[PDB]
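Re: your question from the hallway

Yes, I did run it. Sequences:
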Amino acid sequence: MKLVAQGSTLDLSHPHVMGILNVTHNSLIEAVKHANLMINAGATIIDIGGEEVSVEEELARVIPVVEAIAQRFEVWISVDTSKAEVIRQSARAGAHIINDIRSLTEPGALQAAAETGLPVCLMHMQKYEDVFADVERFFNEHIVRCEQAGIAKEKLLLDPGFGFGKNLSHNYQLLARLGEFHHFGLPLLVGMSRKSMVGQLLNVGPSERLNGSLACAVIAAMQGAQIIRVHDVKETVEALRVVEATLAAKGKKRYE
Amino acid sequence: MKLVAQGSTLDLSHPHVMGILNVSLIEAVKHANLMINAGATIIDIGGEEVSVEEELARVIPVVEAIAQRFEVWISVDTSKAEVIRQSARAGAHIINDIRSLTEPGALQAAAETGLPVCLMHMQGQPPKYEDVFADVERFFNEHIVRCEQAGIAKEKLLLDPGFGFGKNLSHNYQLLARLGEFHHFGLPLLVGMSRKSMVGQLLNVGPSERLNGSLACAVIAAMQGAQIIRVHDVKETVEALRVVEATLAAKGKRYE
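Structure:
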């Protein structure tokens, strides 16, 4: 399983760590330093997000960071934006993945992302009757909605959306059955770092959630999750390195 | 699945974190106080050529202090028969010998105590395997009969693959990837992977920077139904296995 963008490929046969880069001045250089740390720590992908905010107020916070990382480093760039103009601008700047939090449901965003030809990540968004069935239902509706706009299935990513409209029970039901989402034949991206799953369960502050976030990242990687979006890249890369050695000695790709 | 000793029972339906208490005699009581508050259910005591009179002086006043004050289970890592018969008299619950009671008189001494005994696979020095999983499986069948033919029932037996003891990095992850397959003996599984060479040689890190990899091994083992996890860092392990519990609970309860 691969992912093609901007002439380069991303071999998703092993777990990748996605570093979080928030830009919401010296921030251009201060974010490049933060990108340099995560890349040295082992981050293959860097998620850039700067979000209300005007289209002009957002293009100036995202584009120079996308160009700087794409010109100075060799890592994939995913942009978290819902505006159709930022999506079209980021692709020409050097971005590799469109990781919209609203799944391109904004006016023109789906059409703009179809023009770029870049991979797109669909994430479940919202009480449920069966949160797994709803996330499955969300994935089927928007896979067709992207195939209608010319976006091929090969350039799609699925994200269950941990912590977005879900309580602690809904999140761990998806974490327990995360490997079951592999029937779509698409890569899985999960973001669980420093979230309320670890906070509510452990009753700790947002700075004391590394131990639980590492456990969530390992549990996800043991089920074949291809991309793990974390804040603590160095600790997550070391944790996934043990998962890679375990899965290598198993021959299979995941546990079920 | 349970475990009875000294009148109290140990519910092995959920993973238990075993702290490592290596052994002025009140610092071991303080260090035990820290681990118990950190979530340690069992506390492993070890005094490592120490003579019999010196080892009895190191272990027993610590066992009595923990047995008569705290409410946690105590496991003693001794190979001397007199220490085994004396630790049970002090309040110890589990006989966790590293040599699996192969020392003179250690087998019959532990049979008189009626305490649960842990059997750990080892190369021979307190390597090359045709199939390390088959040898560990062979070591269990040989020593289970040896305990059964000495009066020790099967209900009072634990199994330990013995990570790092006469095993290279490849052998260890072959056992960690297939750890759940050791459940066919119907016996509880104890694993110790904290700060060992699996994390060091895989991450190319020193003994001080192995917590991230050790947590990954503990989570991987707990996802496969391991009942007891012997670690140095109890606080971080309790938090990590706590996410494991929430995942297995929403699953209904072992990955494979």
